[PDB]
Amino acid sequence: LNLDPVQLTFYAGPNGSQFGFSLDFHKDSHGRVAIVVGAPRTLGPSQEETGGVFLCPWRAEGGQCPSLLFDLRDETRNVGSQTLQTFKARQGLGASVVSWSDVIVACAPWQHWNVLEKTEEAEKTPVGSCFLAQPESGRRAEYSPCRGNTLSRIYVENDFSWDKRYCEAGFSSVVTQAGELVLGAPGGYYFLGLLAQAPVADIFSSYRPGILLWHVSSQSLSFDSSNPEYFDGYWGYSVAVGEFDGDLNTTEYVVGAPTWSWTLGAVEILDSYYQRLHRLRGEQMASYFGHSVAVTDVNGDGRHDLLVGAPLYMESRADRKLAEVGRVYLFLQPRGPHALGAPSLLLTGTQLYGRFGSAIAPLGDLDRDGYNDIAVAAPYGGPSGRGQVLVFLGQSEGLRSRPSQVLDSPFPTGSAFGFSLRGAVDIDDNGYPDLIVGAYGANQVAVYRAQPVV
Template sequence: MRKQCQENIVFDVSQACAPLYHWRTLKPTPEKDPVGTCYVAIQNFSAYAEYSPCRNSNADPEGQGYCQAGFSLDFYKNGDLIVGGPGSFYWQGQVITASIADIIANYSFKDILRKLAREKQTDVAPASYDDSYLGYSVAAGEFTGDSEQELVAGVPRGAQNFGYVSIINSTDMTFIQNFTGEQMASYFGYTVTVSDVNNDGMDDILIGAPLFMEREFESSPREVGQVYLYLQVSALVFRDPQILAGTEVFGRFGSAVAHLGDLNQDGYNDIAIGAPFAGKDQRGKVLIYNGNKDGLNTKPSQTLQGVWASQTIPSGFGFTLRGDSDIDKNDYPDLIVGAFGTGKVAVYRARPVVTVDAQLLLNPMIINLENKTCQVPESLFPVACFSLRVCASVTGQSISNTVGLTAEVHLDALKQKGAIKRTLFLDNHQSHRVFPLPIKRQKSLQCQDFVVYLRDETEFRDKLSPINISLNYSLDESTFKEGLEVKPILNYYRENTVTQQAHILVDCGEDNVCIPDLKLSARPDKNQVIIGDENHLTLMINARNEGEGAYEAELFVMIPEEADYVGIERSNKGLRPLSCEYKMENITRMVVCDLGNPMVAGTNYSLGLRFAIPRLEKTNMSINFDLQIRSSNKDNPDSNFVSLQINITAVAQVEIRGVSHPPQIVLPIHNWEPEEEPRKEEGVGPLVEHIYELHNIGPSTISDTLLEVGWPFSARDEFLLYIFHIQTLGPLQCQTNPDINPQDIKPAASPEDTPELSAFLRNSTIPHLVRKRDVRMPEPHRQNPAKILNCTNIECLQISCAVGRLEGGESAVLKVRSRLWAKTFLQRKNDPYSLASLVSFKVKKMPYKDQPAKLPEGSIAVSI
């Protein structure tokens, strides 16, 4: 339906078309041609007429037999009708225009074939234009600057299937200008609409391409559809198109585009775009886009969904759209949505828009905490305060004389939930208030007043950040008239929140802005810590302010993961005992010290913070303590950043010691003779035991050490000290070369340790005992110089031991049980000998990321 004006007569026009209407041709054949037809009704259906421009003798596909007139239609502003017939002339298509008055005046039920005198049609084109579908969509607008409207027609299969839209002269039906699609088979021109979107007085063109495929990933294109907006700059000059893209695959976004008029009363026309197969169960959607000075907002302000439509078949909700008609006479344009799958049409009535102008007024806006002019009602406690005024006015088309608003005020609104609110309403001691605010439409600002006070300054720290006060308003639906079917809404392009700020007066000069100059220096009491040591560390810190007051000033010390905070240094009277506490934010551990609120100009603090550093095994060569002073001031709030590097080193003092028992042997032995070929251990000779201890004094740990013993085994094929058993205590794994007991002599049971050996072992640390004292090995008494036999002049058996992890204070012990091969020495009576074993160690590795430049090693000789 459309209101038309012709020859000074205003009347409503309704038109319905049947583009698949068939009629039997004049030829003697049984075929029927889909010529299409339309019915036009005026003056509330008091008069109507049929209009079928393609029902004529020019039948068959090569003529107008398949015209399908009425496939699309629109009206000129003077009331003339525009009809699209995309099937004419082998589906080249055509556009036909006629006067409504002529259609009504010349209508005769008996006259089947009629030709109107002022009817205009586009002519047949060359064969290359076949299957182009001119007239698939039509619209009217003014584009040449002559005040005469042109018609616009979509040709979705023209231009080699890229599609195009033509501007056609309404006088002689000649083609003036084309807009061509960017993608083949996108059906560019499927729909076309004209609207002055940006309110510049010139008509703009919107073109739908519902089959456009998004090719962000070439291997998997997505059919989402697009709509192109061409803003007219001057006569037949347009900007590059603004593109609105669909978001749902196969939703056919852009199947319908409708001019709505100004829905939200902002001075710009709005547009509806249909996506008839989008949404849940493909029930369809209609998206509303609001206009602005630059075109259309890229995000829809509202989405209508066909939730009421059929769930068994696609409803096609949004397949057709018609807007810019005030059906319910409330001075707002309404929207008609067709859903062909359900055989239904939905009418969406526009709601009146209420625009609110709200204000928050504070007096004074800078509060002096010393100026306590108000009293808390219950206690009469004096407090600083200020007045708060909430004001509002309303405007809108077709709204009530009185509009009820609900106002909500939050004091100190930027403070997080649970934080102390610095300001409260004086009458109820709350920081939040909800109250009704009725506003009369004819009046200007209407206000309500409140008194707000500040808590005592001992109850909060933040004196620098502004006190943010927010006003949020909404429509009070309880004030709507009963039976009101279309309720008003707030203008959603106007923020419904108003904020204002008050400030606390601080000692920062006339501008009330403090600019501190914070300085920070620090040094450790030691520059190096040792892995395995107790590692107590004190940071000596100096913090000072050489500028204006620093509010909520705090010292932040970031603690490395290897360290733990112990406390402040109290033994030095020259250090200030500040209040410091351990905190953790996310995974960052820190110590935070209060430096004052404010930290006034000229402040100079020296303090010490004590730490323990127990976890160094898995760290690198150094750790860092990061320090900074921070304040809540807006300008220059922080000090310089200080990073203290503490070097880490591994130090292990390792020693080797040994003992022989007995320390000496005198041959021959009373009442004993060696066997010629001994079969048992006792027949070899006297028992000789050597014990070697590898001791890690610490403090660091060693993890891989090689312990080697050169054992005086034989000389000139005669045995010297014959080994029967090797015993280890601690993390040792040993092997010999050559094997021990090569004569396969039966070993005796292991004897008990002698008191001397027991004393040696008691002073060892096996397993994991701290050695209490060293035991000096007794020196053998010799009257004559003895001949020394060692690995330099005899054959030695090699004992190699891999020593595992030894913490500081732990030891590993190797015990060798042997027999002096008496036969060898009885042949050389009266000759004294000294048999020496050589034991050595070499630390190969410590269990840390970084190894010391030099690892411990050493050796000793143990003689009998």
């Protein structure tokens, strides 16, 4: 409703770096808000794409950002009559970023990994890796839970069970308020998908550089399955956390699996031991239900509510015709221990191929009326097809069915404006929470400041 669309703030990275693919707010030890922006195709040392992370200080005029430097050198360790190898070329560092306390987690989902033992090998595969930085101190650490040292023949002899070679850990990420990092790995267990969790503090204290294969004892991974419904489901394409079982001492995990059960798509709510509590099945095949998930309480009863994006949903129109527009589903958590029910609201896109629902960002309370609100992206929507961000206001019964405000893309065609969203933080310290929108196709981030309601 009250985001200012006139005086925007633009930050920009290098050309072709895909600056703005991911972003998040970051507060330092003194509570000063910055923006952390991932750029997954920034050039490395050998003039090859490796990705990179930028830490932008808040300035109303915007501009360029300093780099949050990570090591981009390939690594080799000859130990235990084996050879460990990490390949950071086209690893995509900055394809997801997330902030917790004064720590930044940047992940490279396509970092490759191989183990050589004479004439055998593990196979060079994208296990993924994440990089952790404490900018104020300079501390650095890595976390790569899917790295193994098992040779390729063993997997064949055991029918490819527990095969974490193509995890792509860091594809999606989130951090519980207690400080547990949860990584989505859609390719784990031969493209079923897995989750990996470990406390940030234990990632830092158990990491030493050059070890390449180290244990993190407090870490916890999900489990393989023989159920065909999970095959090629990409369990972990999107991840989120929330409170869904009534017990406040437990944190629950929300996991998107947009090709679950032969591209039906699904979202599951689990406990921290990855035991399943509820499962939201998709509505239409290939709609990519579960592409994006969001957790926030919209109706103000203190019970977290769930949102799920299906950006390829095809709306039925006259003359038996279908129109890919994208759809968002709202599920309101009921009172006490009961399953989540049918959707309380359906939001369907307007523009053909607009991909409404590609990103869903909680805004906090934007108009300060007592109900939390959200922003939904349609990165190829709008009457010009340049991109649109739609704001929906919370209310006692759920969400309003019509948007209160629409942000049209200030960038040219192909910018993918809205592909990444993040709200619910007040960056200019005016009492109202603000919204940052990424446009990786234009290598830019736009900051929308909320202002008092007119």
